[PDB]
Write a protein that binds this ligand. Structure first.
Ligand code: ETR
Length: 173
């Protein structure tokens, strides 16, 4: 299999606090329009109250050919599903995109990898018309082959197999 968003599995008993820290974007499936290009690094935090938030850094290619290092902020609201959040985001720079997107943690082991996903528009059939997904790593060097195998499985389960591209890290930001 099913490609309906509602049938997708998410991370069981997702732990916000164990998820905190630095996450390096290894690969990504882009959505329609503008997006972060490369050199993406995210820092997740959780306050005493259990409110998760994050800050992201990354290179954005302005429609005008400007390359900017974007500094982004996102706040997450919890839902009835511990692994599915509503994320409000904005940039430090007023010209960076602002919005609200679903943010689901598909899978993670907290120590090595993470698979994230967001459907910004649903088709009439329940499938996703415009999505994005990131594969994160704790270590910028990546994962082992064993983890690589888990990640591929998750990508397939999301109906996004073969749609990701490797993201370069050259500390542009
Ligand atoms: C031209 C304006 N520049 C842009 O077009 C800038 C854009 C899109 C930035 C989009 C940024 C987005 C969605 C960031 C989403 C996410 C975060 C906030 C931080 C947590 C994880 C993230 C999932 C990595």
């Amino acid at each position: 299999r099913d490609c309906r968003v509602s049938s997708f599995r998410v991370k069981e008993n997702f732990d916000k606090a164990r998820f905190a820290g630095t996450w390096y974007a290894m690969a990504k499936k882009d959505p329609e329009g503008l997006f972060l290009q490369d050199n993406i690094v995210a820092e997740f935090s959780v306050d005493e109250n259990g409110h998760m938030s994050a800050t992201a850094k990354g290179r954005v290619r302005l429609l005008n050919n400007w390359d900017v290092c974007a500094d982004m902020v996102g706040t997450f609201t919890d839902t009835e599903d511990p692994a599915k959040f509503k994320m409000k985001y904005w940039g430090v720079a007023s010209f960076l995109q602002k919005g609200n997107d679903d943010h689901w943690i598909i899978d993670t082991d907290y120590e090595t990898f993470a698979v994230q996903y967001s459907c910004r528009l649903l088709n009439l059939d329940g499938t996703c018309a415009d999505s994005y997904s990131f594969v994160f790593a704790r270590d910028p060097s990546g994962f082992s082959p064993e983890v690589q195998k888990i990640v591929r499985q998750r990508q397939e389960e999301l109906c996004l197999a073969r749609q990701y591209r490797l993201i370069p890290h050259n500390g542009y930001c």
